[PDB]
């Protein structure tokens, strides 16, 4: 039948006041015969009406996709506000209900450590700089890399891993040209988590 996904907003969006965090309700496998979908949005029970309604999108075994995006307020989500999407379709026994909300629990700050390139690492054309992060709750986090107030996009970051005490850890590796590193350029590890003063911290790293 028609399946539904309700996605939380990018943690950056929720922690960056200059950005629009949005919850997203995706409906897939809607039929050619019964295409209309009605969305109902609720914030802790109270219905709300501002949601955007995107047009249908061609899919596969003569199907459609429909998405409705609802903006949220930085402080709202952060507070623990529960968001509910209600999907209705003539092909639905009952209307489907999805519930997303920031994880409840006593918040904790991420500890951040940096690892410069090893000796073997330093023989290659491209060296990788590494960033370790632990003891954070909840798992929603954004880690990015910069150098001289410009973004560095050549990195991967592992999903948060559950720790035995309830907090979360991860690592992120940025790869760069050895010359850029040899030149003296500073590279910074930007961590945004709710439990950081102003949501922002940054460890940096250079030779030697």
């Amino acid at each position: 039948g028609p399946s539904v996904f309700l996605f939380p907003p990018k943690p950056k969006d929720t922690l960056m006041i200059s950005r629009t965090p949005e919850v997203t309700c995706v409906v897939v496998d809607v039929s050619h015969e019964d295409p209309e979908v009605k969305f109902n949005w609720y914030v802790d029970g109270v219905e709300v009406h501002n949601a955007k309604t995107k047009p249908r999108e061609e899919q596969y075994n003569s199907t459609y996709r429909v998405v409705s995006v609802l903006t949220v307020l930085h402080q709202d989500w952060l507070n623990g506000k529960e968001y509910k999407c209600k999907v209705s379709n003539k092909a639905l026994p009952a209307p489907i209900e999805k519930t997303i909300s920031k994880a409840k629990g006593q918040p904790r700050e991420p500890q951040v450590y940096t690892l410069p390139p090893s000796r073997e690492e330093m023989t290659k054309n491209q060296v990788s700089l590494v960033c370790l992060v632990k003891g954070f709750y909840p798992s929603d986090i954004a880690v990015e890399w910069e150098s001289n107030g410009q973004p560095e996009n050549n990195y991967k970051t592992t999903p948060p891993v559950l720790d035995s005490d309830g907090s979360f850890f991860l690592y992120s590796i940025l790869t760069v040209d050895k010359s850029r590193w040899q030149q003296g350029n500073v590279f910074s590890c930007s961590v945004m988590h709710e439990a950081l003063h102003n949501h922002y911290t940054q460890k940096s790293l250079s030779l030697s």
Binding site: M16, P151, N198
Partner: peptide, 13 residues
């Protein structure tokens, strides 16, 4: 207290 990320406003206290 305001923090910035790549010139974009993060947060204020």
């Amino acid at each position: 207290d305001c923090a910035w990320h790549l010139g974009e406003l993060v947060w204020c206290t």
